[PDB]
Symmetry: D2
Subunit: 346 residues, 4 copies
């Protein structure tokens, strides 16, 4: 039984890997991809999502929506377009760009071209899916969560029928872009704060706690090559170059011998949650902090001290680690998908 889902993301090298996993996994039935602002503008993340789909021969099959350009109440941190940063550095996209098929979203919306795309386009599609869902509809989110916050402001009564599985936050280790907070939260902390208060069933499936243990080592690289290079050496090198585009920065700035892979871990949670530990708690997102906005603050310590003197209700599930065998299961899943993509590319 396949699980219908939507992907909300900001590709982004990590997000590209997540899309690949979600789309090629037979267990996930991707209905649409919506893109958000991030390190680059939402127009660039839109193009990068479509680049990903076209590379894997699915750009004619999956509608892609271009979402909101900035946070709810804060400024974008996106580079100016005059920096000339694609957001998917490391490879030449010129062939993928020029062979790009028509976006199926355009026909859904009755638009003639992509210049008509508006941030709230995805709303009606998501509402159809939420309404049709027997229990809850599954959204995988691996960038800022502005798009989902905007949706819930327009459709508050849908919150109770949405399940979110995200790459976001840090709990028992420190942050990345800021001392104690993670990029996806700190770029729009009000958005995640809204979502947690809305009635959404929210899982922090892939915080830094987990993703910093999911490292692209030499062993992983050789496993990738073994699975892909017999079928498409060109795809092999593309995927390696993308995985290692920020390897120097991770090493020199962040002390990483081998770089982490974040976003696909969230999709893996929807595919195979048995590999993850889970704990329910109350998560407060810092919004007032001058230096600490986006911190994910929990009552986990108070639960381990004095369980039934706890005031605030649980509003989230947090996955703090993978179980034994979980890392191997994750890499086997990713390698399988990359192998299948390699076969289709040829």
């Amino acid at each position: 039984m396949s699980i219908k889902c939507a992907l909300d993301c900001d590709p982004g090298h990590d997000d590209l890997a997540m899309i690949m996993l979600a789309v090629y996994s037979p267990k996930l039935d991707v209905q649409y991809i919506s893109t958000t602002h991030g390190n680059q503008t939402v127009n660039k993340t839109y193009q990068n999502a479509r680049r990903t789909l076209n590379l894997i021969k699915r750009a004619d099959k999956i509608p892609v929506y271009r979402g909101y350009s900035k946070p709810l109440t804060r400024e974008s941190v996106a580079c100016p377009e005059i920096h000339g940063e694609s957001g998917l550095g490391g490879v030449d996209w010129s062939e993928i760009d020029r062979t790009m098929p028509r976006n199926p979203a355009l026909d859904i919306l009755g638009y003639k071209d992509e210049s008509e795309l508006r941030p709230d386009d995805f709303f009606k599609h998501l509402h159809r899916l939420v309404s049709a869902a027997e229990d809850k509809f599954d959204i995988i989110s691996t960038g800022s969560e502005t798009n989902i916050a905007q949706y819930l402001l327009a459709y508050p009564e849908d919150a109770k029928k949405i399940r979110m599985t995200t790459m976001a936050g840090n709990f028992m280790i420190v942050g990345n872009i800021m001392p104690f907070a993670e990029f996806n939260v700190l770029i729009d902390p009000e958005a995640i704060s809204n979502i947690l208060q809305s009635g959404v069933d929210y899982t922090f499936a892939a915080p830094l706690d987990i993703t910093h243990t999911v490292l692209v080592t030499e062993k992983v690289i050789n496993d990738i090559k073994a699975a892909t290079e017999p079928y498409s050496p060109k795809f092999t090198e593309m995927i390696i170059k993308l995985l290692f585009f920020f390897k120097d920065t991770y090493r020199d700035v962040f002390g990483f011998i081998d770089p982490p892979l974040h976003d696909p871990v969230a999709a893996f949670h929807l595919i195979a949650p048995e590999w993850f530990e889970h704990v329910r708690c109350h998560v407060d997102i810092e919004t007032k902090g001058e230096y600490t906005y986006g911190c994910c603050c929990t009552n986990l310590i108070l639960k381990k001290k004095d369980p039934t003197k706890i005031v605030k209700p649980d509003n989230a599930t947090v996955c703090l680690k993978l179980k034994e065998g979980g890392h191997d299961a994750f890499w086997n899943q990713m390698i399988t998908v990359w192998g299948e993509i390699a076969k289709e590319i040829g």
Copy 2:
């Protein structure tokens, strides 16, 4: 010579008067009304806008959109009619179909969504030669949401609002006014967006626009020869909160707020204007929604101007305002009849 505009509001007795003025004024060509959350839910403010239109025989002419139910990042203050003082049961049951439904291709009102108005506003903004005029007299959540979806449209929008207090204190909170403090982040966003923003009717002005005995007698004189029923309805609505204004707020005669903003679009020559930088307080625990300006620092001598503020009506302005309102009420009375 008419000015195309949209009304964003939360009726509300004040907003009802503003709708009447804007719609019946030949100078303002109302394209649509969007409603927002306030003291009452956005579903109630929606119905109240439609009640107003149907009372004045325009519910078949003007599309009404139902907007956002809560602030961007704060909780609603809406309670479980919003237009007390009269019986709306006949107006409700004779209500014609909302023209917005045909614009949207909807079969019924349950399909209305908060972002419905977006495409209509964008068409109007795109078609405008200079800027398109929006009159806003409730929370500004709807416009903030619009600008998040259409950021490039900010530079082609002109906003005329009833909002804020500057040289006097607030109403619902010590130093802030209801429309701002209910969603301060919204107005903060708008001021930063590139919108041409005028605080046309802060409390500074509206607390001098008072429904006195003289005003009531002028209303009666203009309306009661044509529709005694409308006369009493409008008086009952104007005085629904008179005791609360007296006992809570020290008002001998109650203020009328929102129509003053529409009057600014009709006849701005009656208003004083000053340009300044307005900072909206969002971090304050007790002072969120305060409109803080650099007006004092300008009179002594950094931050660029982001708004126009109208601090008073000029001599003759109050009389001009009441003459305009009474004229419109007179015309409505004629259309309603006995």
Copy 3:
């Protein structure tokens, strides 16, 4: 029948008038003056307090303490005299020894430390039958610092202050008054401490206490027969900021703030009083120091009262105030002579 008290202030022309009133009034028995930071450094406010005392022939009688140089957790706004309008060179060079030095066992003023006043105040608080009275007319940093060192003394202190604005807007910032906004955490601490706190002279009152032509002529009549030199000094000091008050703040005639707080201790029957909960804004970016009350919620109907607020002088109060001030100025004039 006299009331023992201490003055905490930042002279300042207003504070100078307050010192004069408190010291020469037979109803107030001034034990000491402590000075605080303000527009000028605490070292300058110290000298200005001593200048005031020496002008009125009391610098040998009243110990003056030099208090804290900056707010608890914010930066000073002090610039690199603080009593412009007159030449103090003679008053400075004839300055007698500060009696505080002998109380402290110090040889010279360079040994003065901000916490020097603490032991003296504690002796007074301990000896008080009920509560000891402090008049405060600058930042309240000194008293906040005292209460951090002597928390158990809070319940035996009564504070009468010039501070805040409630039903009108602020001065130096849009919605807040100078004395609060310079150290809002200090007043926040004090209100939470158990001190019996009265906002005796907010802007609400002091902006109605105006140095008009009539006042100036009453001053001249009372002083100039005894000391024409003192007459001109006091007028020049009262009108040093008259142009700025007019041009910046719209004042035809300038206000006199701080002495109104001392007048409250002398004759409280001239003031209206209301009890409420005051929250001091500390988190606001543009609104820190706002005095936010539950007065509106009380007139509609949770948080316990923590202050008394005087919102107006009663009929006759302004005349009683000016009669008291002019009497004191007359007595000072007599002691100075020609």
Copy 4:
């Protein structure tokens, strides 16, 4: 050459160990001890400091001051005295209490008894020491830093002649009592914020980053016993019981097999700084955060990225780790002191 210093602390089991190290080390010449509010009231921390001194036969030699009872602008987190918590649980102090000699501070101040002690008593003594110092005067701080903040408000011109060595903060790991902040900072973040802005030469000598690696293991316990029990078995058991009083809480709540020892690490920095790594940076203390007040936020990442595009001047030294051999050097120092104390007790 001995280094004159003052100790500001809130004993506290950790603080007790720090006092022992500082007082019995010949390299540190302790001038006075000032106590602050913490988990218990400042009156209890005062008594606990005097208990420590009397146990080690120094209560007649070192003046102890009782400092401020609460933070600058926040409420105390001290238990009510009706909880009946000493603040030095694990041993019976009744003999130490009744043999307590007169506090030398009383004669310095001209007081007849301890009930006359006031929070600002230490000010004049510290100012004498700061004035006499050739370069800067050294303060070791291992609780809330309210006392030093209060001092600097009264003596702002002394800031430039004070060097502070503290146990405080967490940088590259998460907090203890709150998700991302450490107890000593979060109890009065405004105090440390004031100090960093004042011109004090400030070293975070012992953040959790270090102290969570300084663990009282079985090996340590046996080394203690070997050094002390031949001279005073009673002292041996006292010190062990104190070191392990919170062992269960550390294990069950915080995942510690063996418990950390915090405060003495700060004194060890003044004794032997060569065992510590140092980095200069700008530290911002979060004061506005609702859930994150007391977070120590640094520009260390921006230094490793783009050194000479840094705006804010350095205001602190941070010690992020001990060098190789540092842990062993620390334990050798502590064991030596405990051995010497054992010999004096007999």
